[PDB]
Amino acid sequence: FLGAAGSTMGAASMTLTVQARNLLSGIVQQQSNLLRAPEAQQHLLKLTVWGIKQLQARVLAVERYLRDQQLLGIWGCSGKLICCTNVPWNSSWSNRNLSEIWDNMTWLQWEKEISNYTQLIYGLLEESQNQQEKNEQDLLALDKWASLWN
Amino acid sequence: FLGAAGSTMGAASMTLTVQARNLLSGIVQQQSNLLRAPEAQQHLLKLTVWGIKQLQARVLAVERYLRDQQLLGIWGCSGKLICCTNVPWNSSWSNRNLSEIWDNMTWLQWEKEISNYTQLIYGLLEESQNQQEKNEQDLLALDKWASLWN
Amino acid sequence: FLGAAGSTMGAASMTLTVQARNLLSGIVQQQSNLLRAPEAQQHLLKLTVWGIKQLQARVLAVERYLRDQQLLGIWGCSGKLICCTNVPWNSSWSNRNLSEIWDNMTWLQWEKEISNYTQLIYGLLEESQNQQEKNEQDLLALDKWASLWN
Amino acid sequence: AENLWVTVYYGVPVWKDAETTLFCASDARTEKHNVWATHACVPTDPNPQEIHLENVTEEFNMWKNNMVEQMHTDIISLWDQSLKPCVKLTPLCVTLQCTNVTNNITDDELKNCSFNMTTELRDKKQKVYSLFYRLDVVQIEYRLINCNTSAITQACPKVSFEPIPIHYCAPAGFAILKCKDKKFNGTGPCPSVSTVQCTHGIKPVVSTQLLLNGSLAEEEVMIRSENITNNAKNILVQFNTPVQINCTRPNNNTRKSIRIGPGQAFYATGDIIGDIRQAHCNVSKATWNETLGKVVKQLRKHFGNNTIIRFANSSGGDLEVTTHSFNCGGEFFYCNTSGLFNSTWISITLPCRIKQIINMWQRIGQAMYAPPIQGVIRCVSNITGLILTRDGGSTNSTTETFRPGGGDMRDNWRSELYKYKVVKIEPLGVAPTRCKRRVV
Amino acid sequence: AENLWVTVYYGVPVWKDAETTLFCASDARTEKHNVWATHACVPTDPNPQEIHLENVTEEFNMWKNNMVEQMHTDIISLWDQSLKPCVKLTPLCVTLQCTNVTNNITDDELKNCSFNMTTELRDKKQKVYSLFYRLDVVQIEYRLINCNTSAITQACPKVSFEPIPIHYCAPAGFAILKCKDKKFNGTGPCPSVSTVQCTHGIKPVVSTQLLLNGSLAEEEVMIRSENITNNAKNILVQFNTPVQINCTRPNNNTRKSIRIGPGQAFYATGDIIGDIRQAHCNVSKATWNETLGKVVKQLRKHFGNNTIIRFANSSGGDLEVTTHSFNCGGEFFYCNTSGLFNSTWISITLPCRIKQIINMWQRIGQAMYAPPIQGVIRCVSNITGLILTRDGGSTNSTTETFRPGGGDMRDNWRSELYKYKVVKIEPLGVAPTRCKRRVV
Amino acid sequence: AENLWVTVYYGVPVWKDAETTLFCASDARTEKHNVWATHACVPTDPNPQEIHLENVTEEFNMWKNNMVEQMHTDIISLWDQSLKPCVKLTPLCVTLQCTNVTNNITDDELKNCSFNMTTELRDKKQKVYSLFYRLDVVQIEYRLINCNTSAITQACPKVSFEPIPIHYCAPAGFAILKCKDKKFNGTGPCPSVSTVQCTHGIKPVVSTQLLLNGSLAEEEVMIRSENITNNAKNILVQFNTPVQINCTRPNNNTRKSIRIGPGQAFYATGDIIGDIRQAHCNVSKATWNETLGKVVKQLRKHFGNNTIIRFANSSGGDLEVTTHSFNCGGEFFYCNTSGLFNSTWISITLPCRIKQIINMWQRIGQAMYAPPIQGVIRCVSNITGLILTRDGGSTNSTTETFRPGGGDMRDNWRSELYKYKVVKIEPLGVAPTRCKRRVV
Ligand SMILES: *[C@@H]1O[C@H](CO)[C@@H](O[C@@H]2O[C@H](CO)[C@@H](O[C@@H]3O[C@H](CO)[C@@H](O)[C@H](O)[C@@H]3O)[C@H](O)[C@H]2NC(C)=O)[C@H](O)[C@H]1NC(C)=O
Ligand SMILES: *[C@@H]1O[C@H](CO)[C@@H](O[C@@H]2O[C@H](CO)[C@@H](O[C@@H]3O[C@H](CO)[C@@H](O)[C@H](O)[C@@H]3O)[C@H](O)[C@H]2NC(C)=O)[C@H](O)[C@H]1NC(C)=O
Ligand SMILES: *[C@@H]1O[C@H](CO)[C@@H](O[C@@H]2O[C@H](CO)[C@@H](O[C@@H]3O[C@H](CO)[C@@H](O)[C@H](O)[C@@H]3O)[C@H](O)[C@H]2NC(C)=O)[C@H](O)[C@H]1NC(C)=O
Ligand SMILES: *[C@@H]1O[C@H](CO)[C@@H](O[C@@H]2O[C@H](CO)[C@@H](O)[C@H](O)[C@H]2NC(C)=O)[C@H](O)[C@H]1NC(C)=O
Ligand SMILES: *[C@@H]1O[C@H](CO)[C@@H](O[C@@H]2O[C@H](CO)[C@@H](O)[C@H](O)[C@H]2NC(C)=O)[C@H](O)[C@H]1NC(C)=O
Ligand SMILES: *[C@@H]1O[C@H](CO)[C@@H](O[C@@H]2O[C@H](CO)[C@@H](O)[C@H](O)[C@H]2NC(C)=O)[C@H](O)[C@H]1NC(C)=O
Ligand SMILES: *[C@@H]1O[C@H](CO)[C@@H](O)[C@H](O)[C@H]1NC(C)=O
Ligand SMILES: *[C@@H]1O[C@H](CO)[C@@H](O)[C@H](O)[C@H]1NC(C)=O
Ligand SMILES: *[C@@H]1O[C@H](CO)[C@@H](O)[C@H](O)[C@H]1NC(C)=O
Ligand SMILES: *[C@@H]1O[C@H](CO)[C@@H](O)[C@H](O)[C@H]1NC(C)=O
Ligand SMILES: *[C@@H]1O[C@H](CO)[C@@H](O)[C@H](O)[C@H]1NC(C)=O
């Protein structure tokens, strides 16, 4: 868990070689402590201080842990931990050397590079994913027998 | 958001050309107001009126926002915002002209057409999706080398 | 619901022929009773005994109902109710006759067989699913035109 | 044609009418100890994104609306939650030796009462100055009116009573419709609707018989009822002109702090500076005459253009069904508004009384005690309409009589949640098309 | 064979025994102010879909069951939540000048007490009529029994005490098993089980020594114990025959309302109409004799067919371990049920006393005060079994002695949650097959 | 090169600093009625998996840390939740006829007071023995000090006050950083950090002017401040040597139980065995001299190596800003620690007083009453540092003066949450690569 966060993306190219360095299961295996004793306390006590503070924190992790699954679903990438797009590396003017990136730059530094236009990338993804591609799939509803590829 | 709900399905064929007119992200981006201040209040107050009324409303949107994801998973359509089936337009006796439908009829009016048999459609989908198709996929576990397509 | 749990896996090979004998929708359709009256009570009462006991039980089913969806996502099996792997039936030394298994053995008895090494299987799945396969997919990013299959 | 194939569509813009909880939203500005702010429940209130639809004639209703009950039950719950941690006044229900006051004009009045009190070390009691009104004491020489009913816990003086406006925001998976048709009366298909995520600023004021600060309509002053036919239905009316009510209370009203037992201070009215006059509200007779003319001219739309008479309140009842009652800066007024209703068919002062001990402002049972306010009280803002009743009876053709009824509080917020409706969102839709899956 | 390949299966019908919270479910019928209904917690209670399995012999247990503690801790929590907003009676613990009553037969009795009370304007006290029982007052002329322990807050009279049946419904991801084997004694592998989503209607009655309205077994009247070997274990027995108990209280019992301070009324027993008789319950001696014969004939199954004697409930303890105690229409009875136990080996009245001040019905500490009931009290329904104790001792072979023990309340609901069990659902299963993925 | 293509990466190990709620975690050991344990909130506390990172220099802060407020507001909330269901002592604020005690040495003292009390049947009062201290009674012959402020509800005697250590565990989607740099002073980039899921054992002690049982640093005894430049900033100092404080209270302190009204016992100090001596704490002068030398030698690192003088805490003011105050086994000590501060530039006893009525240990308003402890009180453990203030003023070059300030409680937990920080986890990252989708 977080075992090579301090590494560069080249030395975090091994993190994507492993289960994103166990980040996603680490999002959900941290719930197992509060999964293990929310009920096993047998006390009356007439009142609960953590009756909301745990429960507010518990559903906070779920909604945050579902916005990404909703976002990977909207980019056709649900289930795939790593997937490429049809949108290229666009005119986003953080254009540079590849072996500057995947050799010597940390992910945190990589975040510091493209902290701007991140929402611009995020709107850009669903454009090619649905607004051209899904209607291109509806264009694959012909099934001719004599004049397919005219 | 909801920008062409009053339109016909022909003029809501542009809604499916866009992100279902931003309906699905609109289901989840409405959570961001209560995501932004559930904790930022720094008050003691000894008691919470919205300590349950928000929390009951919060998990109501999650379970409703998960029954559909569970239902698209059961029809093999998880991730796909639009997908067709193997069940055809069956003997459901709301049979009519296509360019009556995808030209001049609102989605609300379309709901008024097939308000009945909607659960009959919903049971009909999982029949062809699993009860024939998944065992047909288990029939693709042969891998012969000399007598494949006898 | 649970209609052939007492059956052997051979007579629960019909359970996988149906919607896992309606187990997954049964996980979520049991929520519909507490979906139907959490709010329809119109009483003041100044205090709630089930204000936490329902809500703790409600989000307990969600997190348990999401760890599996997270686990099927990590094995590339999200959406697929039944899927095979690339990991074979390994050196797990519960090695036996197939028509001993899929003819005469209950699922509960089958659980009693492989209660051990179950976590060993679970770690074994993500190894072939990501740590070889996803980087093999990154090895499919070449697109040559004259020397593809050298 | 060929056999079509059903195709799911996830995110279809359809809706059903449903019922669910909403939540308040307001803004920050310290002293968030307001009894409705609950220390800024959702203090965000972001920018109001509003989206028109323009192609849908969605029906509405105001007499089957669910949001008014959620508004009503949250107000009483925000009331008692504010009133809980304050001081109980159960040692105050004792015998009172009272007498009148003598410094100024008659027809105001007040009572000079004293009692054995201050209860400080459980052992020493004192004869205490106090100055109470009428309409809160009864003879047997005196006792408070509420001692045959329940307890009389007082208000905390640090909290306020200014109804700062709130916003009801829909939760996820729901939407708030909003009819933009400027002549939508009460109930029916609205042609021009729009969608918001949160409502506008809604001041939760409380007033019988005259609703104040409102949401003013357009120049057709609207008439709202469930049905005109039944005489036993209140009639709402909405204005378009902000008529002013210059209310004030004349006196200077010195406070006097009393120690009761442990650290529980009690505030009683000290002896005032000594100019005992009447509480009153000045209303311009000209503008009031013009507003009634616009009202009666659209009242004649509903039935024959003949013989409109207006009356004072009838069948007696408690203050709160007869006088226009409200508070002004945490000081609760009761004005005999008889002098507004003569027969209109072709500056005004108003005598305002003051209670200090108030009942539960809807219910019977528990009752609060208002602390006094120092200085001179004066406040003024707009009216937005009235609550009227058609009497009917044997008047088969003529002499149509109206009296300003209205005792419920839900009809206040019915006059502002009329142009809103909540709908659930059903993002799952199916349709047949020409696509079919490629079965492997 | 070839190397197989592991294949996941999502939704496998397996289960593990687990522990989680459940929730009540009942039906609607106004006056939902019942102390266990909590104003209709889940008022749906839909149609009971029940599914048999027929091919599984699942083990059960009743002495390690978890649902009885969840039933027990919810009852005490529903108790105090009902008892919270009512009137405290801490001004009642005073000295009482008492005397007897003289109108009717002896061997009933009551005490004519009076005290300085009514405390209305904090300043005026009154000598008040009251009529108390015995078994709730002690000498020093008198005081209440509970004033050396804690407070004595009374019941709200508007609530009821009829134990309307509830349904425990499982949450999602869990299931409720149900053994259908009609001779499953207490613990072991049940051959015929079935699954429900909710339990049946369970009346949460409270009774020592004789459990009423029950869930009656089949004609083999069952014997339930943890082990017969240990003498320090209570023995449950279940009936198959609804034997009747015609209980009544004779007198007419006039109420008398007392004002205490602020608006806190207090209800005391006024002077009754004047026919002071005894509270009693008539039991048919014939049917009672036949039921014991069925009991002893299956008691001889567990050990040698010789010398069965039954005895009076064990001497000593507090009423609640000796008398069959219960309530009838909000009136709490204590009947010396000595006259049911002679040696059976080969109409009956019962003297019922009445307490009014009750302890916490399990605990020590806080204590409630029952208000009186007007009119004549009479109620009747079935029994379903007893709680017995084997004495053992030096009786190595013969003279087997039983006395109707039982002081705990959990053994009531153990007699109805015996045929239920909760299991979690583990929908993730793996198996090797002949399929392998087509690697691209 | 060719045009690259953006590729999402789910689970990137990046973080942002954020703020969220945490939760306690401890272990089991009955008698979990500890006022901070809240009956074992999360009683798991599993094995502490700790992971180093070694390649990141992450910044930290201790003066902008959020966890100390979450620690501070949970302690006061765990305080009042413990203090809620106990006995109120509002009948105790009465007049007290007091006199001195005469058995032993002067300069200790105590007052022999008696009052009309025991209030048992609302009608009989008694003259009651009591034995109070000084510093909690005032003349007018006497009354308690807190009767001009609010109520004086006492502690439940069954609960304890031993600060058992707790663990703050992060929720899901968050992580707890931990700086391992042994010379990280207060704020800046820590070169060697590590990640934990839960903190270590943190004893929530409460002590002014001398923080006890701590988390001792390494042999460089660290100096912590927001900035040295401003004189109006408290200075924390951390030790490396567990210096001992043998504290004790001499007397035997007999308890005396009093019945008050209903079942509300009250515990007052009975007449003791009769050896009235002084409460004191012995400190070894040698080791105390050596620790100050290490302190001043690193104090000279921050500014010129000249003229260090230490002082008493001025004159006047209250106790809690002047005396080192704490509790020892539920008995609250106040020691004039003047005798620790002479000018250091080149066994000790301490007079400890005892209050029994305590204020709210931060606030004004409600106040608790400690019950007495039977027997002889003695306890001893380590110190870990002090809270000092630089005076400054006109001392432009020399005579540097320090006095042991510190009145806030947050600076206690600032001395232990300095090496921790919470971060949210952002698992969504994008990067351009050479892969492109195969569009069908
Ligand atoms: C009628 O509308 C007014 C419009 O704001 C509501 O607020 C009241 O406004 C008056 C100003 O004319 C306030 O009076 C004075 O405000 C000054 C501000 O500098 C303050 O320093 C004085 O102490 C004094 O309060 C008044 O406070 C304010 N609130 C109230 C309760 O009168 C008013 O609420 C509306 N009235 C009704 C019945 O809806
Ligand atoms: C024994 O079983 C009965 C079966 O219902 C339980 O309910 C009691 O039923 C009797 C009817 O024989 C009720 O008495 C009368 O009911 C009429 C209905 O018209 C009502 O108007 C009268 O005021 C009177 O209540 C009785 O109320 C009802 N409840 C009680 C608490 O007796 C009864 O609860 C069962 N007893 C036990 C100890 O379980
Ligand atoms: C200082 O450190 C000690 C280390 O444990 C903290 O705990 C106190 O330890 C002493 C032992 O020297 C306890 O005294 C006695 O413990 C025995 C155990 O057999 C018990 O039977 C006696 O009744 C007596 O309590 C003491 O209880 C315990 N707690 C307290 C509050 O003194 C101590 O808390 C630390 N002091 C401070 C101010 O942090
Ligand atoms: C207010 O506007 C609504 C818009 O629908 C009118 O409502 C209906 O109008 C039709 C046609 O006039 C009548 O047949 C119905 O009886 C009306 N229903 C109701 C509930 O009023 C309505 O006429 C307008 N006026 C009033 C006074 O409500
Ligand atoms: C009740 O039925 C159960 C069904 O299993 C019996 O339980 C076990 O039976 C076997 C075989 O007779 C014994 O060896 C075990 O000791 C029994 N266990 C227990 C806990 O009883 C049981 O014998 C039956 N009778 C009783 C009185 O429990
Ligand atoms: C404590 O260590 C920190 C580590 O960064 C030092 O902090 C900064 O150090 C630089 C270089 O000396 C200064 O320019 C900054 O002004 C320092 N900032 C702060 C907030 O101190 C710091 O000097 C060290 N010492 C102290 C007493 O804080
Ligand atoms: C409404 O329908 C008209 C057709 O008359 C069309 O021109 C217009 O774009 C539609 N508007 C919306 C919002 O659908
Ligand atoms: C139980 O097993 C028998 C085989 O003896 C089979 O005939 C029957 O269908 C099975 N029932 C169920 C519910 O699995
Ligand atoms: C009253 O009406 C005036 C005129 O439009 C407006 O400016 C003001 O905001 C209204 N409300 C008050 C004074 O509360
Ligand atoms: C008692 O037994 C009879 C006979 O079966 C039954 O009809 C009745 O419902 C039972 N319960 C009562 C009277 O509460
Ligand atoms: C005090 O210091 C000693 C010496 O390291 C240590 O063993 C002990 O645990 C410390 N804490 C106490 C006595 O509470």
Numbering used by the authors:
A (entry chain B), B (entry chain F), C (entry chain D): 522 to 671
D (entry chain E), E (entry chain C), F (entry chain A): 31 to 59, 63 to 141, 145 to 176, 190 to 395, 411 to 504
Please give me the paper's original passages concerning this structure.
The trimeric gp160 HIV-1 envelope spike protein (Env), a transmembrane glycoprotein comprising three protomers each of gp120 and gp41, is the singular virus-derived protein on the virion. Hence, it is the sole target of protective antibodies arising naturally in patients or elicitable in uninfected individuals through vaccination. Vaccines targeting HIV-1’s gp160 spike protein are stymied by high viral mutation rates and structural chicanery. gp160’s membrane-proximal external region (MPER) is the target of naturally arising broadly neutralizing antibodies (bnAbs), yet MPER-based vaccines fail to generate bnAbs. Here, nanodisc-embedded spike protein was investigated by cryo-electron microscopy and molecular-dynamics simulations, revealing spontaneous ectodomain tilting that creates vulnerability for HIV-1.
After purification in dodecyl maltoside (DDM) using the PG9 Fab for affinity chromatography followed by size-exclusion chromatography (SEC), the recombinant gp145 was reconstituted into nanodiscs with a molar 1.5:1:1.07 mixture of palmitoyl oleyl phosphatidylcholine (POPC), palmitoyl oleyl phosphatidylglycerol (POPG) and brain polar lipid extract. Further processing of these particles yielded a density map of nanodisc-embedded gp145 at an overall resolution of 3.9 Å. This map allowed us to build an atomic model for ectodomain residues 31–662 and a backbone model for residues 663–671 (see “Methods” for more detail). For gp145 by itself, the distance between Glu662 (the end of the C-terminal heptad repeat; CHR) and Trp666 (the beginning of the membrane-immersed MPER) is ~10 Å. Our structure indicates that the MPER-N segment is partially buried in the lipid bilayer, consistent with a previous NMR structure that showed the MPER to form membrane-immersed helical segments. To compare the conformation of the MPER in the context of the full Env trimer, we measured the distance between the N-terminal end of the MPER segments, i.e., the Cα atom of residue Lys665, between adjacent protomers. In our cryo-EM structure, the distance is 30 Å, while the distance is 53 Å in the NMR tripod structure and 16 Å in the NMR stalk–bubble structure.
